[PDB]
Amino acid sequence: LFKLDLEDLKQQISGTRFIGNLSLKIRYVLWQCAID
Amino acid sequence: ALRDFAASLLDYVLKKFPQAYKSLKPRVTRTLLKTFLDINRVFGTYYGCLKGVSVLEGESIRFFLGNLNNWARLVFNESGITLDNIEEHLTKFTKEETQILVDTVISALLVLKKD
Numbered sequence: 001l002f003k004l005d006l007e008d009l010k011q012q013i014s015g016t017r018f019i020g021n022l023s024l025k026i027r028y029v030l031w032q033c034a035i036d
Numbered sequence: 037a038l039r040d041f042a043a044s045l046l047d048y049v050l051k052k053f054p055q056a057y058k059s060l061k062p063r064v065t066r067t068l069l070k071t072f073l074d075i076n077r078v079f080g081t082y083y084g085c086l087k088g089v090s091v092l093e094g095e096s097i098r099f100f101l102g103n104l105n106n107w108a109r110l111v112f113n114e115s116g117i118t119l120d121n122i123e124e125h126l127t128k129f130t131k132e133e134t135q136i137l138v139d140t141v142i143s144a145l146l147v148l149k150k151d
Contacts (some may be wrong), residue, residue, distance in 0.1 A: 016115075028103075031099065
């Protein structure tokens with residue numbers, strides 16, 4: 001039954017919008033760690 | 037008007053309580069850096085974030101120099117553009133609030149080049 005869950009995972013990670021949001025979140029966590 | 041008033045009430049409480057420095061300066065700039073660094077927010081939250089950045093000072097504003105390019109490339113969609121058809125190109129916002137964002141992002145950037 002995990003095939004529909006894998007297709008729902010592929011439905012929510014494909015495209016330009018998700019990887020750029022990840023690039024914003026990792027920049028947030030790097031600057032938040034390096035704030036001091 | 038409420039964003040511009042509440043942003044100039046945050047700067048009033050960063051100076052009324054200087055004994056709590058290093059306990060509400062990094063907390064508030066961490067709140068603003070956490071709320072600012074995303075795509076799925078409405079325009080007014082970004083405006084309040086940038087005005088709260090504006091009512092800070094010094095190297096902290098420089099601390100948002102690096103992560104502004106990718107923020108613009110995600111929120112304004114310059115996917116290979118050559119800066120020519122910018123008036124009628126863009127996707128989340130309208131033209132007026134994008135002009136407000138480009139105005140307010142250098143309304144705070146003037147503090148880092150005046151010293």
